[PDB]
CSV table of N, CA and C and ligand atoms in Angstrom, one decimal:
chain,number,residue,atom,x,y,z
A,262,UNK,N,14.8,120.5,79.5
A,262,UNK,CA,13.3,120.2,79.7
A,262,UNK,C,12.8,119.1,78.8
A,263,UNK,N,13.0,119.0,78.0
A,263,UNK,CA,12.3,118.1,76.8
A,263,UNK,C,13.6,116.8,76.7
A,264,UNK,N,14.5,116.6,77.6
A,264,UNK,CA,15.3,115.5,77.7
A,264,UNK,C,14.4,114.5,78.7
A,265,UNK,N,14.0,115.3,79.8
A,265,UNK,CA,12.7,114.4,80.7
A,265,UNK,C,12.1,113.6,80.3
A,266,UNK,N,11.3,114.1,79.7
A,266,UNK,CA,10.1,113.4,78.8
A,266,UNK,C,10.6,112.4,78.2
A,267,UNK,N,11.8,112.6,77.2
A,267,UNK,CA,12.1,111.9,76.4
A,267,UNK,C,12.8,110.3,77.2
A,268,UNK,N,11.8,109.3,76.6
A,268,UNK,CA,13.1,108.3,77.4
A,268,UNK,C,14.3,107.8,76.8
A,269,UNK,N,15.3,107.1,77.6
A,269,UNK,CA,16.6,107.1,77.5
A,269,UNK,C,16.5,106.0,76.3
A,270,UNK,N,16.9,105.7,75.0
A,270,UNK,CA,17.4,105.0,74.1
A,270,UNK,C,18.5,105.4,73.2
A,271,UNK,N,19.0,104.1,73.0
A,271,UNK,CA,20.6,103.8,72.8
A,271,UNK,C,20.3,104.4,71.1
A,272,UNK,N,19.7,104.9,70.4
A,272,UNK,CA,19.8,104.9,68.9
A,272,UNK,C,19.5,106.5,68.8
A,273,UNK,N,19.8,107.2,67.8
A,273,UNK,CA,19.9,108.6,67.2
A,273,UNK,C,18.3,109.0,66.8
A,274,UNK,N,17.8,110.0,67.6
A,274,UNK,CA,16.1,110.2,67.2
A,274,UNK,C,16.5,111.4,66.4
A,275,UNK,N,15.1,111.9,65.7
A,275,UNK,CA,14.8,113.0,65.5
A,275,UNK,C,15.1,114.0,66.3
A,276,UNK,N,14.6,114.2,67.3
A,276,UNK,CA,15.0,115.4,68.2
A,276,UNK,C,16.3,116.0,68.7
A,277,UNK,N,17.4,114.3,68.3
A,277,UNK,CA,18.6,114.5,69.2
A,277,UNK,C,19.3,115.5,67.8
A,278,UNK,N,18.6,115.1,66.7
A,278,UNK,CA,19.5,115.8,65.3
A,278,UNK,C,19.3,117.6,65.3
A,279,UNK,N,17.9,117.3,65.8
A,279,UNK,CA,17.2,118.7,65.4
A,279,UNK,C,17.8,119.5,66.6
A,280,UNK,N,18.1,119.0,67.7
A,280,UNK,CA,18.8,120.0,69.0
A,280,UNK,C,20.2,120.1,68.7
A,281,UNK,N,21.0,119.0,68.2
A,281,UNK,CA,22.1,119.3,68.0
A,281,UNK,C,22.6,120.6,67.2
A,282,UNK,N,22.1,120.5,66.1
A,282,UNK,CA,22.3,121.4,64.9
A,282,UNK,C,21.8,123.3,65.8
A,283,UNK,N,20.7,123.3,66.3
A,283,UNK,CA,20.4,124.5,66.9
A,283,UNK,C,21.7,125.3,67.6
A,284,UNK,N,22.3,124.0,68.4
A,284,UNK,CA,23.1,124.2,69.4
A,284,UNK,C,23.7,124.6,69.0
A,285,UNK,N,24.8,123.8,67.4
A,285,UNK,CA,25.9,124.5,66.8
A,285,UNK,C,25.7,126.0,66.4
A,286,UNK,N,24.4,125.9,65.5
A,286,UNK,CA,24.3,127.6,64.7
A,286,UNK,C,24.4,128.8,65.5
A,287,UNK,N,24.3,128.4,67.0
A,287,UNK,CA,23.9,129.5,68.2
A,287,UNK,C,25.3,129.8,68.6
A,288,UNK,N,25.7,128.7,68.6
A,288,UNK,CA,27.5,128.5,69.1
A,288,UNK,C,28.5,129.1,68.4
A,289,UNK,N,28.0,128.7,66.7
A,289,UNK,CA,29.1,129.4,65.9
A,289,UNK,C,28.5,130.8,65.8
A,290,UNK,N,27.7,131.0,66.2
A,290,UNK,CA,27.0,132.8,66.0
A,290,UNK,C,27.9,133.4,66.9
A,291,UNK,N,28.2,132.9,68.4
A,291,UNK,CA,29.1,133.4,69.2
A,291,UNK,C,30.8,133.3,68.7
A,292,UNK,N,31.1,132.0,68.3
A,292,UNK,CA,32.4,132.2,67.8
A,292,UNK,C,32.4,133.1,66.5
A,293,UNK,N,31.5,133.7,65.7
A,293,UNK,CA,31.8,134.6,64.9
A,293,UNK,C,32.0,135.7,65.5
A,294,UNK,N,31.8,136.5,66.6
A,294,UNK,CA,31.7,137.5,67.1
A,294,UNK,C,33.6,137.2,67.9
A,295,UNK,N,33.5,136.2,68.3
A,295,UNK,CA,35.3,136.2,69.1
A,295,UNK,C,36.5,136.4,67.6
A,296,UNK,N,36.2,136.0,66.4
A,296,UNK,CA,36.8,136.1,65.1
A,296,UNK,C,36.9,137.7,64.9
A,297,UNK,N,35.8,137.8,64.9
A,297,UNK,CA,35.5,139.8,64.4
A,297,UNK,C,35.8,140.1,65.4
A,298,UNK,N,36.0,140.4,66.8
A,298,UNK,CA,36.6,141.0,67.8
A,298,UNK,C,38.3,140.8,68.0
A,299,UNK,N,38.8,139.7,67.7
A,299,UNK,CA,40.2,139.4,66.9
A,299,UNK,C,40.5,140.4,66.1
A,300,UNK,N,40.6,140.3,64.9
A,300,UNK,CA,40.9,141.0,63.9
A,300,UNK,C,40.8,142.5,63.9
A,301,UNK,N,39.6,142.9,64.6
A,301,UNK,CA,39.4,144.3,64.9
A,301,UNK,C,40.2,144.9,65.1
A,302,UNK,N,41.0,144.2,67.1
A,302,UNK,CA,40.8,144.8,67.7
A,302,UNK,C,42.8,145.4,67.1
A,303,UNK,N,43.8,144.7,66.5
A,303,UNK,CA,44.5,143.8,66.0
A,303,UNK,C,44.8,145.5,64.9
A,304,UNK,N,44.2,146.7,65.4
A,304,UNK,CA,44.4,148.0,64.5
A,304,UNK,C,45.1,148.6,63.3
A,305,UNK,N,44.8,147.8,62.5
A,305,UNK,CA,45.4,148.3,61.3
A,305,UNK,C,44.2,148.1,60.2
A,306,UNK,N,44.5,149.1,59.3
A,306,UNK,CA,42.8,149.5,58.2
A,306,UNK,C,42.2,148.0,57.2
A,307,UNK,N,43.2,147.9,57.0
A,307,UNK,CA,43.3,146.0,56.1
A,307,UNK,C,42.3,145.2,56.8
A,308,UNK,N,43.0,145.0,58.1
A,308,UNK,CA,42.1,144.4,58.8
A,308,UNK,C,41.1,144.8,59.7
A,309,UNK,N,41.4,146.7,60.2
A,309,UNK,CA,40.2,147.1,60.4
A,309,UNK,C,39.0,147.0,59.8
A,310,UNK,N,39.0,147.4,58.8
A,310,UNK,CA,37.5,147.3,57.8
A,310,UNK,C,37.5,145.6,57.3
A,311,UNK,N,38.1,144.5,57.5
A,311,UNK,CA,37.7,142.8,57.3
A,311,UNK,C,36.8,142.5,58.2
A,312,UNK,N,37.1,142.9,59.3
A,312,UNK,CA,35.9,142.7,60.4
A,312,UNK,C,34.5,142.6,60.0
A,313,UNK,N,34.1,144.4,59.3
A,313,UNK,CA,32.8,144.2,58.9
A,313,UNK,C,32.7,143.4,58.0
A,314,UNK,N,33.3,143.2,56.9
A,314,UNK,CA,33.2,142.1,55.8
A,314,UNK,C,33.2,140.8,56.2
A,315,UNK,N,33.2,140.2,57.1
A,315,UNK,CA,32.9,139.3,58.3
A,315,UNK,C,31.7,139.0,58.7
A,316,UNK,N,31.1,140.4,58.9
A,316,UNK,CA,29.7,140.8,59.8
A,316,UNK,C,28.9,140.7,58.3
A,317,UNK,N,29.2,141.2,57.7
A,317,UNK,CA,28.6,141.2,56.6
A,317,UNK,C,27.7,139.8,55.5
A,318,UNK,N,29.3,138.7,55.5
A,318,UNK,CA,28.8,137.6,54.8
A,318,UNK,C,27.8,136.4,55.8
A,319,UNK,N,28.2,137.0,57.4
A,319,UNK,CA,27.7,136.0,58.3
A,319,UNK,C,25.8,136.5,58.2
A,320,UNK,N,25.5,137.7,57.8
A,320,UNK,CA,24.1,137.9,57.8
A,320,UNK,C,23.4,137.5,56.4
A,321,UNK,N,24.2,136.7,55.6
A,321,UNK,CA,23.7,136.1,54.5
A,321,UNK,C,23.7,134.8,54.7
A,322,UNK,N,25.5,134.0,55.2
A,322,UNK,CA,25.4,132.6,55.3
A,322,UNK,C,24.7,132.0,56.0
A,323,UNK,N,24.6,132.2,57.6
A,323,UNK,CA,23.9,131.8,58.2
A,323,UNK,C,22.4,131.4,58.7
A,324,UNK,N,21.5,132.3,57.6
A,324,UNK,CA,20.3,132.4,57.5
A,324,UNK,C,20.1,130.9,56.5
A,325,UNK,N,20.8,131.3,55.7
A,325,UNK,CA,21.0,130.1,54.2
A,325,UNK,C,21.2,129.0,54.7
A,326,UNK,N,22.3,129.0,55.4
A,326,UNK,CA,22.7,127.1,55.6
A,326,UNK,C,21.4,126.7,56.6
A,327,UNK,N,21.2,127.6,57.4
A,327,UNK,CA,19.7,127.3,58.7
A,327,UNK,C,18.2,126.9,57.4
A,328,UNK,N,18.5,127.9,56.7
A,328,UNK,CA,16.9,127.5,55.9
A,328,UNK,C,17.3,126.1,55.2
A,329,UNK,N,18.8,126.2,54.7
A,329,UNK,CA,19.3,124.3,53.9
A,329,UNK,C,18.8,123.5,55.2
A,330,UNK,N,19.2,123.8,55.9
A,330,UNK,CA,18.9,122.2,57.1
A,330,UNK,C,17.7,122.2,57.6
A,331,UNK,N,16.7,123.1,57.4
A,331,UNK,CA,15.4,123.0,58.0
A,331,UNK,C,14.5,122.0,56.0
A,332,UNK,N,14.8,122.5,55.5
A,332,UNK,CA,14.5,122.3,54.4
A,332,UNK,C,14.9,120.4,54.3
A,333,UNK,N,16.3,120.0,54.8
A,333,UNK,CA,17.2,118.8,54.7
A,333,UNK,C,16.6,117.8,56.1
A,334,UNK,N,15.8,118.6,57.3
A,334,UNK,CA,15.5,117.9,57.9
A,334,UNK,C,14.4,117.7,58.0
A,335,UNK,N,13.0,118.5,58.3
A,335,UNK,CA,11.7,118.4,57.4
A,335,UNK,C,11.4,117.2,56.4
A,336,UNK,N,12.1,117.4,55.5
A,336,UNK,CA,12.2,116.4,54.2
A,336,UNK,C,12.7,115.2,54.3
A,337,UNK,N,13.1,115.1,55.6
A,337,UNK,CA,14.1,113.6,56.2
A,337,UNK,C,12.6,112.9,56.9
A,338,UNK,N,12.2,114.1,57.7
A,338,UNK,CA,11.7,113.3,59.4
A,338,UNK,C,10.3,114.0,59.0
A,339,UNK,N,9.9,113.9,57.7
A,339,UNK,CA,8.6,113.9,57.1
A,339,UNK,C,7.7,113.0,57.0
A,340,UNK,N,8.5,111.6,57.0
A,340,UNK,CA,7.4,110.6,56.7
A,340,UNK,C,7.5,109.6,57.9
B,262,UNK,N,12.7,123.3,88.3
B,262,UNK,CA,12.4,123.0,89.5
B,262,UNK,C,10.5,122.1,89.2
B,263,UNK,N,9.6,123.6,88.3
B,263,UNK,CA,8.2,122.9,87.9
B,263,UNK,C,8.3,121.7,87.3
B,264,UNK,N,9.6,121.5,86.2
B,264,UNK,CA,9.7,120.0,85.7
B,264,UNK,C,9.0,119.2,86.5
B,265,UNK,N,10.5,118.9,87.5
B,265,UNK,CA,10.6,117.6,88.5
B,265,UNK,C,9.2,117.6,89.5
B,266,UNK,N,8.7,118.3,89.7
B,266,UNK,CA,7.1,118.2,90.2
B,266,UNK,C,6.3,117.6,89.6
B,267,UNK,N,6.5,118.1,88.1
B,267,UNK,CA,5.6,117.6,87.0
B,267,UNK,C,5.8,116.2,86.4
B,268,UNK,N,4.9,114.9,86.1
B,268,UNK,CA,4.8,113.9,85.6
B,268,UNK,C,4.8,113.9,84.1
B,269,UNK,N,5.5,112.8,83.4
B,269,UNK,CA,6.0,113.4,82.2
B,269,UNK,C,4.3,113.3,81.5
B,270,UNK,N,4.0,114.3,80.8
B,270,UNK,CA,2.9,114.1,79.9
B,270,UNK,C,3.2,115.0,78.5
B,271,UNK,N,2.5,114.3,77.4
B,271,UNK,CA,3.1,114.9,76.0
B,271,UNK,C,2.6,116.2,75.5
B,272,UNK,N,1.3,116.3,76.1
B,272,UNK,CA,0.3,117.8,75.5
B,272,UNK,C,0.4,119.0,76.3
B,273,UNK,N,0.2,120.1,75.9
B,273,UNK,CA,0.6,121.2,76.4
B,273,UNK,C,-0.5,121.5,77.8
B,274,UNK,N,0.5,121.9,78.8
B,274,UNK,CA,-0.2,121.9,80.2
B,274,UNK,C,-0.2,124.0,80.5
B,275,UNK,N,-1.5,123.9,81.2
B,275,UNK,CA,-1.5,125.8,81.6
B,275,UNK,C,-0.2,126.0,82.8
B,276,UNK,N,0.8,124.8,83.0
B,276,UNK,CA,2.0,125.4,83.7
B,276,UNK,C,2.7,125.7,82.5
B,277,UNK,N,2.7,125.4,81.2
B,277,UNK,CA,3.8,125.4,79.9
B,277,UNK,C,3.7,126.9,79.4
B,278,UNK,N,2.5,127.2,79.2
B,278,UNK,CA,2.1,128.5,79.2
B,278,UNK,C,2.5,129.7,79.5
B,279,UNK,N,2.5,129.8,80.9
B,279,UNK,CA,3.1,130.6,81.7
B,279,UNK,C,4.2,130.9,82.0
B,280,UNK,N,4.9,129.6,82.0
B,280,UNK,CA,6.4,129.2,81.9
B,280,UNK,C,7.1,130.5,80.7
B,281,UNK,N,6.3,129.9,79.6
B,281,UNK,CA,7.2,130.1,78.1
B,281,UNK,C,7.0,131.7,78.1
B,282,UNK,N,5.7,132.5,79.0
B,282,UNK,CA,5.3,133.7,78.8
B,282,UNK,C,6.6,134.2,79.7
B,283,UNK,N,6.6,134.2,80.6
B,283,UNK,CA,7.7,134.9,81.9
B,283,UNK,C,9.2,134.9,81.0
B,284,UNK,N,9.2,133.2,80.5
B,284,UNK,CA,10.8,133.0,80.0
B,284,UNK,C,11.0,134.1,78.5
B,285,UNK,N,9.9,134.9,78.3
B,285,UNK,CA,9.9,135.5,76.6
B,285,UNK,C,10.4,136.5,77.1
B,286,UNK,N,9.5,137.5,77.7
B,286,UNK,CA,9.6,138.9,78.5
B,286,UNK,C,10.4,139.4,78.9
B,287,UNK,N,11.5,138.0,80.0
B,287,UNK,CA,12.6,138.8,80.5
B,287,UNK,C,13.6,138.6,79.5
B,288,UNK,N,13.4,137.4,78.4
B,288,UNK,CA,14.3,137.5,77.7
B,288,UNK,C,14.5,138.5,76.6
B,289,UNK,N,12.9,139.2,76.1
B,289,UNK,CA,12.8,140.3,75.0
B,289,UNK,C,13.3,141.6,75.7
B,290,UNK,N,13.0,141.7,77.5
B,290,UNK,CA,13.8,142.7,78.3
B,290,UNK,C,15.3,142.7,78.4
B,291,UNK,N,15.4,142.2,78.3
B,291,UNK,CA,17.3,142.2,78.2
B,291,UNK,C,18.2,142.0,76.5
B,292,UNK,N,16.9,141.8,75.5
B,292,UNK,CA,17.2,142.0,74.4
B,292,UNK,C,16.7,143.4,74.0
B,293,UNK,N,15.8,144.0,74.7
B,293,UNK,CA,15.9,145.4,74.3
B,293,UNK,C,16.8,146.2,74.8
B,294,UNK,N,17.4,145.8,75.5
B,294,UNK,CA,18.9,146.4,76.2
B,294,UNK,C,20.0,146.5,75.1
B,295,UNK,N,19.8,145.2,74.3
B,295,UNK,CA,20.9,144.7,73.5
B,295,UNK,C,20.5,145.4,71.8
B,296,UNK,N,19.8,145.8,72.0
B,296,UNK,CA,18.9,146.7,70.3
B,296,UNK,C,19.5,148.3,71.2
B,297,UNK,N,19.1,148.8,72.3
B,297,UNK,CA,19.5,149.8,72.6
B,297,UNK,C,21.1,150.3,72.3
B,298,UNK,N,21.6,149.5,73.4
B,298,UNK,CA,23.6,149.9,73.3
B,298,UNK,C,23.9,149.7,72.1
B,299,UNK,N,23.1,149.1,71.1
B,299,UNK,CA,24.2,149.0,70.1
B,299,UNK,C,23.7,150.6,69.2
B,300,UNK,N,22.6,151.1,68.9
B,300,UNK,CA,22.3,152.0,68.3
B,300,UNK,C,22.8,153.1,68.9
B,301,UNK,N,23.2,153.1,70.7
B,301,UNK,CA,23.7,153.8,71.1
B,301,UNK,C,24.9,154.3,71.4
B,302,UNK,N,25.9,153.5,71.1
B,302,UNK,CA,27.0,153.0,70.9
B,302,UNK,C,27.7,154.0,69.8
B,303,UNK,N,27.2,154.4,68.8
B,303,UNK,CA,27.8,155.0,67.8
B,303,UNK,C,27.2,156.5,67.8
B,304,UNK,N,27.1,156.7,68.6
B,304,UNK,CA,26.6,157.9,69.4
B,304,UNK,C,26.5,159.8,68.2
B,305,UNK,N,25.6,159.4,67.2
B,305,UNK,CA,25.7,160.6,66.5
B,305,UNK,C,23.9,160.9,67.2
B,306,UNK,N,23.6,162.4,67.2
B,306,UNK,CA,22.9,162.8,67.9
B,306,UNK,C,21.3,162.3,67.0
B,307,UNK,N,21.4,161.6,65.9
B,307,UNK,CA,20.3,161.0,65.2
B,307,UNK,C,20.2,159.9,65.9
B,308,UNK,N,20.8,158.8,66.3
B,308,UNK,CA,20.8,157.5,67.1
B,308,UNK,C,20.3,157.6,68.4
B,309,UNK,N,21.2,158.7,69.5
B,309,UNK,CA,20.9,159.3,70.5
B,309,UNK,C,19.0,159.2,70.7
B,310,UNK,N,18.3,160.1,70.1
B,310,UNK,CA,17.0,160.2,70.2
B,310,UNK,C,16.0,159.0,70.1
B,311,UNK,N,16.3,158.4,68.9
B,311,UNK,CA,15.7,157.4,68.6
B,311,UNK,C,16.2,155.9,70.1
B,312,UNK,N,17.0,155.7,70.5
B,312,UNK,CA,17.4,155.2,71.8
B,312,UNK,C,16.5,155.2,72.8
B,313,UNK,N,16.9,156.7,73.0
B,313,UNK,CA,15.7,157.5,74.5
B,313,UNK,C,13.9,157.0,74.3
B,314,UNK,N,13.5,157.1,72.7
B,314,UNK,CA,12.2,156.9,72.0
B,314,UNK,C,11.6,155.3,73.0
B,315,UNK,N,12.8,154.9,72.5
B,315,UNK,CA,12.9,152.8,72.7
B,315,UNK,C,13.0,152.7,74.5
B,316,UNK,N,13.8,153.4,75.1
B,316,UNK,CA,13.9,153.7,76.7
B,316,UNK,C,12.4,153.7,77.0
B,317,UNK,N,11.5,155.1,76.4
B,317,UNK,CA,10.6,155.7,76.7
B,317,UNK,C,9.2,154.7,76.5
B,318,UNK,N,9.1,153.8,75.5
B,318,UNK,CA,8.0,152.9,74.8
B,318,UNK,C,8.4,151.7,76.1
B,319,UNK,N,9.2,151.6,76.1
B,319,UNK,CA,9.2,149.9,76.5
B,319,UNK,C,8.8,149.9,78.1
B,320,UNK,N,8.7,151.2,79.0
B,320,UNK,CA,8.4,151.1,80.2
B,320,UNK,C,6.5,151.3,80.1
B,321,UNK,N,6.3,150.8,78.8
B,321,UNK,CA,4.9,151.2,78.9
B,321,UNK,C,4.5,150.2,78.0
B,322,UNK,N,5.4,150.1,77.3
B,322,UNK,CA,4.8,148.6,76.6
B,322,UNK,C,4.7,147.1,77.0
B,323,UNK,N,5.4,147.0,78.1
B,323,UNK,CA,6.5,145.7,78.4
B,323,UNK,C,5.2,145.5,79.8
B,324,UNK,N,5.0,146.9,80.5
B,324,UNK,CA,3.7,146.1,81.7
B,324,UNK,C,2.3,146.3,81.0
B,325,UNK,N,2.1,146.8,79.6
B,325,UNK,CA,0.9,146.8,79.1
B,325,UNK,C,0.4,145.5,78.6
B,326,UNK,N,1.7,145.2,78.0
B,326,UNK,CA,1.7,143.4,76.9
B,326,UNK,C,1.5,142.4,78.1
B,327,UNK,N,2.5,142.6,79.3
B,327,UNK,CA,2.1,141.7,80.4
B,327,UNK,C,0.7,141.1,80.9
B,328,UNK,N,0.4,142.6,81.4
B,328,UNK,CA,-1.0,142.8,81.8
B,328,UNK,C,-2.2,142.1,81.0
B,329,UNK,N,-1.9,142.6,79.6
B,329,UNK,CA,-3.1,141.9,78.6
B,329,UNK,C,-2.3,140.5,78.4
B,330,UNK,N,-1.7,140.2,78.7
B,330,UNK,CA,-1.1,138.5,78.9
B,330,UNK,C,-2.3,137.9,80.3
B,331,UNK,N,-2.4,138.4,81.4
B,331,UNK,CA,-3.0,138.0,82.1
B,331,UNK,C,-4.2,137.6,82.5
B,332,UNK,N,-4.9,138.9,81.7
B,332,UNK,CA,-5.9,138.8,81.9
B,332,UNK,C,-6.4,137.8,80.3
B,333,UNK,N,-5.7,137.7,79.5
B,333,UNK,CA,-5.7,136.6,78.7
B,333,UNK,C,-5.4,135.0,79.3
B,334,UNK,N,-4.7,134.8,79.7
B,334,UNK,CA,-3.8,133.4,80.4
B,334,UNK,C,-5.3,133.2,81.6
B,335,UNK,N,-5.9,134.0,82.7
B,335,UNK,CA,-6.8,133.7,83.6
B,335,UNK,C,-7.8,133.5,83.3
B,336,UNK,N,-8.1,134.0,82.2
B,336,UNK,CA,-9.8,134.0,81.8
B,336,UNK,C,-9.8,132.8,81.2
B,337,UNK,N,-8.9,132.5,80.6
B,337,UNK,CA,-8.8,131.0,79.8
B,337,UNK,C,-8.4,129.8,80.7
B,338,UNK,N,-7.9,129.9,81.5
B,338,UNK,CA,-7.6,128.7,82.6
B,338,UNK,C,-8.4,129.3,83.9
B,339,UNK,N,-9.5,130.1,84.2
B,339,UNK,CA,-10.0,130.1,85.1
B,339,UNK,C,-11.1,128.9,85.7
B,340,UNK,N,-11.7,128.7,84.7
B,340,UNK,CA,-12.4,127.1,84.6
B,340,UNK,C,-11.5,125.7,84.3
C,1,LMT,O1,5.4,120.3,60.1
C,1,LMT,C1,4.6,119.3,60.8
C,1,LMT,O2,5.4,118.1,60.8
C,1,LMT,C2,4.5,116.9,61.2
C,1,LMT,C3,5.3,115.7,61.2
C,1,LMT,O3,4.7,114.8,62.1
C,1,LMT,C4,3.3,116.8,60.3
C,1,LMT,O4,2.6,115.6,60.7
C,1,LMT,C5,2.2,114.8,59.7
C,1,LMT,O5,3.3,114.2,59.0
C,1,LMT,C6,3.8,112.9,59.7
C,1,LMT,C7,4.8,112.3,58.9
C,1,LMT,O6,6.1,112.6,59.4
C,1,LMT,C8,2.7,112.0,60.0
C,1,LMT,O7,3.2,110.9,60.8
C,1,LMT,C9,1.6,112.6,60.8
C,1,LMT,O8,0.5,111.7,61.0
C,1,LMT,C10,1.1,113.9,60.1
C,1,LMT,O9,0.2,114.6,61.0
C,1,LMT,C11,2.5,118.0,60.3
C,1,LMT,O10,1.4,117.9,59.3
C,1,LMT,C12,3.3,119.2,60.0
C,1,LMT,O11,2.5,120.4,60.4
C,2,LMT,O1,-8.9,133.3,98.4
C,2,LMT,C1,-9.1,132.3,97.5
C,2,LMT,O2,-8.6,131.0,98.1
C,2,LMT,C2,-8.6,129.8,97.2
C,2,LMT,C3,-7.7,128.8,97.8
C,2,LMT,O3,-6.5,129.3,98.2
C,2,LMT,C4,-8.1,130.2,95.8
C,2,LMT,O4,-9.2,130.1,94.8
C,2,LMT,C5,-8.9,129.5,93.6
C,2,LMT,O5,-10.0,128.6,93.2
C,2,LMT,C6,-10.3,128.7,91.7
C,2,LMT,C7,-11.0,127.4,91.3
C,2,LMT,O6,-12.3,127.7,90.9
C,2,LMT,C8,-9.0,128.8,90.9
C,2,LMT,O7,-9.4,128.9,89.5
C,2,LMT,C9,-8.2,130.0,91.3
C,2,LMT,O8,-6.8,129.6,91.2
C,2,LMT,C10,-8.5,130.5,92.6
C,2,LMT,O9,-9.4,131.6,92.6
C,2,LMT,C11,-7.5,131.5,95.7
C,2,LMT,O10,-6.3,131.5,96.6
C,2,LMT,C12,-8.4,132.6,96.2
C,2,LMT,O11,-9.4,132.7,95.1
C-alpha cells in the first residue's frame, strides 16, 4: 500500500530501511519458532527443556535489538 | 482493490480509517484465538476456566467496540 504512493527512485530512502528491518524481526520471530519446534520435537530432556531456554532469551533479545534500531534509526532520519 | 481507485494523496483519507478499523478487528479476532489455544493447550482445570471467561467476553466485546467504532467513524465523516 504505501509502495503506490511512493514514487519509483533508483537510491535507498528512509522508508525502504525502516520496512526492510520490520520485515526481518517478523520473519526471524517465525524462524525462531521452526528452531524451537526442531529441537523439541527431537525428544530427549537436554534438549527437551533447550527449547524453552530458546523461548526464553528470544523475549529479552528481540525487544532489545527492536528498541536498538528504533533508537539507530530515529537518530539517523531525524534531521 | 480501494488503493487502485484511489489517487495517490499524502494525508489521511475517511477511506484510511475504516480500512485500518476492519483490518484491526479481524486481525485482534483471530489473535484472540491465538491467546486462547495457547492457555488452553496446557489444559490444567485453572487455565480451562479462565479460556471459557475470554470465549464468553469477546462475543460481547468485539460487537460492542465495533458498534461504538461506528457510531464514532459516522458522526465524524457524516458532514
Ligand atoms: O517522530 C517524529 O519524526 C518527525 C521527523 O520528520 C518529526 O518531524 C520533525 O523533524 C524533522 C527532521 O527529521 C523535520 O524535518 C520536521 O520539520 C519536524 O516536524 C516529528 O517532530 C516527530 O514527532
Ligand atoms: O437513502 C439515501 O440515499 C443516498 C444516496 O444513495 C445516500 O445518502 C448519503 O448522503 C449523505 C451526504 O449528506 C452521506 O453522508 C451519507 O453517506 C448518506 O446518507 C444514502 O444511500 C441514503 O442516506
Amino acid at each position: 500500500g504505501i509502495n503506490s504512493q511512493l514514487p519509483p527512485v533508483s537510491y535507498i530512502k528512509a522508508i525502504d530501511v525502516w520496512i526492510g528491518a520490520c520485515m526481518t524481526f517478523i520473519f526471524c520471530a517465525l524462524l525462531e519458532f521452526a528452531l524451537v519446534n526442531h529441537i523439541a520435537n527431537a525428544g530427549t530432556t537436554e534438549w527437551n527443556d533447550i527449547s524453552k531456554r530458546v523461548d526464553l532469551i528470544s523475549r529479552a533479545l528481540f525487544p532489545v535489538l527492536f528498541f536498538v534500531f528504533n533508537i539507530l534509526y530515529w537518530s539517523r532520519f531525524g534531521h
